[PDB]
Design a protein around this ligand. Structure first.
Ligand code: NA
Ligand code: NA
Ligand code: NA
Ligand code: NA
Ligand code: NA
Ligand code: NA
Lengths: 299, 296
């Protein structure tokens, strides 16, 4: 059988909340008397990446999907856009909406935010669904060969900024490199929208420079090790989506994690790179919905 | 004795996370270095009359925090997180192993937070007018309460600190008992002639742990104060009357409660104690260093 056509629209009412003096944009749909499901995107995406996942979940659960500070339709203060900046703003976003307990659905740098938050707020986490997530990559050989020269250049002084900031390579090159199917022009224009001006591309370059690869930056490596240790020892319900060949999470790693993470169901989406949501949204959405029905939530 | 206004130190610069940081670096390379950390709105200039008491016998390193002094001015928010990251990297870029700290104001938060995380490397801490949690506004001096509330008031605080440069033109001299001279003022004004460069001056008072906010800073500061209370590291506390961040009663109580701590009364003092009695501070640091178990 064949997949349904993948929607290009973003049929959600926009919201903004003031966070530390800046406005962050977010989606907020579904019923509000239960446990919210908080969807966190990564680099170089926005809440747009969840547009075809949310409709599977919204009939039964609240869906909140923010745009990270400096990204999407959120404000763009003059920050370095280190992980520290994202942590601060995301923590404050969650408090600004008065969220208590949540289910997380997280991806890429959004997964570092989600796992780091959950480790610090273990009483408030009712489940985590995750995919293509940030983990330590101890050698460049564990980074995919098709992306090695590129990410090394991204992290090389002067060259990386020329590619990402001046030439917009993370949007024009790396984003398509992360989707097995071809993105349409309408989809590309949605992803391009926040970054038309090169000055606004700082987060796109800082993010690959924060990835924990070959021990650097050491502070990120430590933080990520800490939340991975937490995840390995946590009874929290877990749902892991993976694809072939993946980028951050190759199939062999997914298979290891299906055993070494407690209470974890792993689901193969088929072909996939980084943005698994773009390659099989209906499997990811339908499986999240089924998994939510099994959790200690509905209030 | 007359207090020197000059800054007779050759520039040193080091690349840190892709940005350049300026620092004073004098004295011999064959011992344990003494790392001097300034706060808001100062620079290594604040240590200019203290360093010469120490440099004959110990290397003195005095960086300008990122965004301040002669250090580069990247487009950051200048949150404490930014200062932590850059200072950690500065220390590693100089290849420092064990150190003695001499710290003040926001420099004290940096130093104590670093020491907590590097307990085997810290061999002594001299400190003054330091950051601790302030649970209510009542515990902030009245001559400055309305001002700091305004600094932390949306839009108003930026008008004062960024547009009008009040932290330099007002708060700085407010923090010295004696009158700062025009030459000294001009040294302190140097990094902030352009209003956009005043961001760190505004973010700092907005990071102060007062009445529980920002909660992340409150937690961090509580953690390093607990660490300090539990550490056998040699400690030297300078204080003055009436103080600003530290009233005399609190200073004297800490001298008793902290392990291995000597307190030194500098006389009249507000925040920038270094400007009111540099010769006592410098000479006492020198004497104290000679008593430590450092190498050599
Ligand atoms: Na639409
Ligand atoms: Na590092
Ligand atoms: Na020198
Ligand atoms: Na005054
Ligand atoms: Na004065
Ligand atoms: Na807070």
């Amino acid at each position: 059988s064949h997949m349904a056509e993948i929607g290009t629209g973003f049929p959600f009412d926009p919201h903004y909340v003031e966070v530390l003096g800046e406005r962050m944009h977010y989606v907020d749909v579904g019923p509000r008397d239960g446990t919210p499901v908080l969807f966190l995107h990564g680099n170089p995406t926005s809440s747009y990446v969840w547009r075809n996942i949310i409709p599977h979940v919204a009939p039964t659960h609240r869906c909140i999907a923010p745009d990270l500070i400096g990204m999407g339709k959120s404000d763009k203060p003059d920050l370095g856009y280190f992980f520290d900046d994202h942590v601060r703003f995301m923590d404050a976003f969650i408090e600004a909406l008065g969220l208590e307990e949540v289910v997380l659905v997280i991806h890429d740098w959004g997964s570092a935010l989600g796992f780091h938050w959950a480790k610090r707020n273990p009483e408030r986490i009712k489940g985590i669904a995750f995919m293509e997530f940030i983990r330590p990559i101890p050698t460049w050989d564990e980074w995919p060969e098709f992306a090695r020269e590129t990410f090394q250049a991204f992290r090389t002084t002067d060259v990386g900024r020329k590619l990402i900031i001046d030439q917009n390579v993370f949007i024009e090159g790396t984003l398509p490199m992360g989707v097995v199917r071809p993105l349409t022009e309408v989809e590309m224009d949605h992803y391009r929208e926040p970054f038309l001006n090169p000055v606004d591309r700082e987060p796109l370059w800082r993010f690959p420079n924060e990835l924990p690869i070959a021990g650097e930056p050491a502070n990120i490596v430590a933080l990520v090790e800490e939340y991975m240790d937490w995840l390995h020892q946590s009874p929290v319900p877990k749902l892991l989506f993976w694809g072939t060949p993946g980028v951050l999470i190759p199939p062999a790693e997914a298979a290891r994690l299906a055993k070494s993470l407690p209470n974890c169901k792993a689901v193969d989406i088929g072909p996939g790179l980084n943005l698994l949501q773009e390659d099989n949204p209906d499997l990811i959405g339908s499986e999240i919905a089924r998994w939510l029905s099994t959790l200690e939530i509905s209030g």
